[model samples]
Target: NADVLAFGAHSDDVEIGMGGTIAKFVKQEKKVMICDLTEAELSSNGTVSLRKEEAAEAARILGADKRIQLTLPDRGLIMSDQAIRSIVTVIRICRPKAVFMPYKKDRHPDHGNAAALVEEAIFSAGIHKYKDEKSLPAHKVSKVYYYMINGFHQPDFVIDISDTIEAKKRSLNAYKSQFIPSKDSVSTPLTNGYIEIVEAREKLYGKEAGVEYAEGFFSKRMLMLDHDVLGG
Candidate 1:
């Protein structure tokens, strides 16, 4: 069974960065799962409980097959043996065909570290020596892609999400605590037109792909395809 796996450092990370791509996969009836590496316990905008609720709402809007939270310490992601083992366990259980994660070089330390952790785990999951006593059999992913967030990079591929633009917006809006303004809430990094910024970025990327909206992605390796899928 082929499934799409997406990993994020926080509850709303995947929704804000790759919601459009996930929604596209869901509409195509492809199984999609999101893994939050850590609970947003330290987010200035929302409490952990509130963020969990928002995560669920966003997952529902994106039609994800499953949403898993690792509950790892927030702002404390480190490349350790324990972290690798934990990620490998999840990889084995999910046995995803494709994995989506943040780029290894990102502005945010957590994002970069998380990407490194996932990359290493994916490789470690395939090695017999790297054993997890209670974990499932080692499973290797066919492809790993990187999604851009809070930074810019030259994308190797783009997905046209024009048709699902509204759905993407609805999915993003699920994180009301992050984007929607509350009178009593103090202004934070996510409070001011963050949603609009995301949408605008999508449009800019879509323009390059000749679409109304799109999501950009990068592949670490060259993608191979059958001739049947190629067009003039």
Candidate 2:
């Protein structure tokens, strides 16, 4: 029941970038899922297992229907043949209307690379010849959207999340292993002031859209408002 499928280089990437949008989707009765490319196995803080548990909690906070974490090498995620096929299989199975990945320009290599990988897989997943073990029929995604994790661009559009911003914060808090400072855990960029930065970003984007909070996205294609353009 995936109406939306969002991908992230790591577990927290999607939450920080689009947690509010995910919550908005759920509030609207739409099902959204996040697919993590890696376990962040090489991160300075948190083990893979702890991250998994935290990711699940985050998904629950967003009311996402699925949390698909692939076993790709964290530091070495690339758009290899197998990686493309893996994403293609999921796209075919879930058949989401909109697929999301990180912006092409980001501080994290995995973040940008994950975008490229999903970009290709989204196209390939629709082709009949592009077959995987699932034997699922080819499914074409309706649209592809890009979310920002590290850097910000004047987004092509913004999804107003004014009502669900608090849900976003709670979801981000779910990744305690990454955001919370513990004596046993290492101090990194995320554990320090990352949440502030993320919340500020939402505020800035929301200001542009005349909303209390929103999530920004990039799209290669122009948007169409064929009907109900005045919903807001």
Candidate 3:
């Protein structure tokens, strides 16, 4: 079972959004699971087989407990009962304490679609009667968070990732086929300093929070403070 379950529309989306956070979680001995909703077959660069390899490497770099690759259609994350049921089964199996998904507002439409899909799955997974083919027991995650993929907003909370920033970079670098351009590779937004943009965004958020690096997250409801209010 996973302590944290992170869902992404594509393989690289998780690294772009919260690689550092995942690394930090791993360092803290948390069992983190990453689920890619699609194989990203429609991506301009990299074959499906190569992308899957890169995803595995990325997960290794982040020290995640497991990585699940689903067969959802790329760029076709529209909400449906089938999709929701599939995700709910995963949630029931993982029984994660926390769940994360991409923020609804993003440059890519699939990211928003993933958010809606995951939101529905989280709700259904908690219901006792929402049984799929496997019929695993219901699981209600205690925390649900949203991470930004291609948009910037004032986050409700931020996690300091100073120690694991290098791990995050390494994880992103594992997807060389997506980030680095070759002679035959088509020029896309990702091939042109996309990592730099992501780092800059993280740095901006870090500066706001007085940290070397940080990952920002949004929550639908007010957080119940569980840690010390004042430093000992």
Candidate 4:
């Protein structure tokens, strides 16, 4: 089981959202995993098979301990009863200390829907009465953190990822079809200056927290500290 499991709307979404943070987690020797809820078939570029390969490679680059794909339909996403149950199953199986999901206020419909489902599943996963076919034991996550996709906000905390930024870049570049355009590829937001803007966003967030580069997160739970406030 992983210490942390990050959930994304699509395969590449995790990489763009918090690849550097995942890399840093690996450096700390913490097991990190990712769950992609959809195959992103509605995307303008790349086949599902190719995107899967890219996602796996990206996860490898970030040293994710496990990669789980739910293969839910893209674009037409929602926090349906079935969707919550499916995610609750994974949450119980993973038993992660913490979970990460996309922030709710995103322009992308899939991202918004993903956040909604994840929040509900995180709550339901701890209920003993909520049982799936496997009948996994109830698992209560310590916390849930929000990551960014199409939108940015003031973060509750920032992780200094300057040391792992290169890994983040490599992970993002794994999806050649998304960042690097081909003659046959369509010119959408992903093909445009998406990567550059994301890099700049990280840099901007870093400045907010006095770091060279960082990943920001939003948390509603109280972050307990040890004897030292700055302690990890």
Candidate 5:
């Protein structure tokens, strides 16, 4: 059921980057799953258990079929065989048609490292001889896309999420431990109007694409325009 497998460095990375797009996919009957590379053990606001709960809540809001959490060290993602193998196993198991990871040029080093690790895993996952823990069949993904987590950049393309923006907001709001500060919560960039910044970024991307709201993405391969060529 995993048509799209979205990987995030932390629990909320996917929600921040492509919640709207995921919501849109759900409405279209595509089975999407979120794979968090790490439990975000080092995040300032919440404990690992709390973050896990928040992530589950967010996944429910986004209508994701499943949320997979790995114990890849938070802030310590590397492109080693061990790390790549872990991701490769998941990729093979999920067998996603399209794979999404954090854009490589993010402020957080873990975000970029996760992208690098996933790149190798995606390539290796398609090799039939490359073995993993369960020895699952090699799964060659048809498409790969990058969603921005920290900064805004001109995307290779944008998806119209006008109808699903509210869903995106609701999903983000599910992370109260991260976005909403409590008396015991430590102040971090995420607690300082981060959601507002995300909304503004999406709005700007939408303006460029002539939509009410949109999420931007980057692709390594050129996209094909089969129907839009003649205004079909």
Candidate 6:
């Protein structure tokens, strides 16, 4: 089954970057799945189990087809041959038509590593001989896009998420463990009105596209034109 698959290094990475876009896709009746490479076990606010539950809740809020956790080591995603093979296998199993991942260059090491890993895996997924022993059958994705997570890069395109912006917030807020106040909990980056920042970013992107709110994306390849088929 063809679907949109989003990969993130941590639990909230996808929500922080592309939650509105995913919500829009779901409303369009498209199947969307999210895969987190790690449990975000290193986060300052929550335990791994807590984060997992929160992730599931967020997925439900966004109406995703599915949400999967790879359980990869936190803050340790390396671009090794084996790691590439593993990701390729997952990609084959999902057979996503459009895939979203973090950008290649970023301030955070994990984000950059995840971007590189996905880039290698996407290419490897297209070649049968790359690692035949462990690789799944070749499956080329139609489009590969990158979303900004923590760091910003100019976007190639933006999706108007104005109608679904409120829904996106509902989804992002599901990760209460990361944002809500708890006894003995210390302030962290996520707890500091990050949702507001996300909303502001979306509004800024939307301004360029003449929408009230939007989600921005960068493409690895040029987006082909089809005037007749656009704007249904």
Q: Write the per-residue lDDT of candidate 5 for residues 1-232, one digit (tens) a residue.
A: 3899999999889999999999999999999999999989989888999889989999999899999988999978967899999999999989999999999888799999999999999999999999987888889999999999898999998999999999999999999999998999898999999999999999999999888899999999778877766856
Alpha-carbon runs more than 4 Å astray in model 3:
none
Provide the lDDT at 125 for model 5: 97
- After superposition, candidate 2 runs with Cα above 4 Å error: 227-232
Q: Write the per-residue lDDT of candidate 4 for residues 1-232, one digit (tens) a residue.
A: 7789999999878888898999988989999989999888887899999999999999989999999989778986766888888889899989999899998778887887898899989999999999865789899899789889877788888888999989999999999988898989999988988988889989999998788898888887788767547665
Segments of candidate 1 deviating more than 4 angstroms: 227-232
Which parts of model 5 have CA positions greater than 4 angstroms off? none
Residue 131 C-alpha lDDT in model 6: 64
Better structure of 1 and 5 per TM-score: 5
Clashing pairs in 5: none
Predicted candidate 6 versus true structure: per-residue lDDT over 1-232, tens digit per residue:
5579999999788988898889989988999989898888888887888888989999998999998778678888976787777788778878899999987666778987988888988898888776634445888988998998776556888888888898889988898877777886779877888788888888889888888998888897889868734766
Judged by lDDT relative to the true structure, which candidate is superior, 1 or 5? 5
TM-score of each: 0.94, 0.96, 0.97, 0.96, 0.98, 0.93
141-213: candidate 2 lDDT, tens digit per residue: 8888899998878988898888888988999999888889988988788888888898899899989988878
Worst 10-residue lDDT window, candidate 2: 221-230
lDDT of the candidates, in the order given: 0.85, 0.87, 0.92, 0.88, 0.93, 0.84
Query: Candidate 2: what lDDT?
Result: 0.87
Evaluate model 6: give its lDDT. Answer: 0.84
Predict model 4's lDDT versus the native.
0.88
Counting only residues 3 or more apart in sequence or on different chains, how many pairs clash (N, Cα, C under 3 Å) in candidate 5?
0
Error of 6 at 76 (Å): 0.8
lDDT of 1 by residue, 63-106 (tens): 99999888778888988888888888888888899999987666
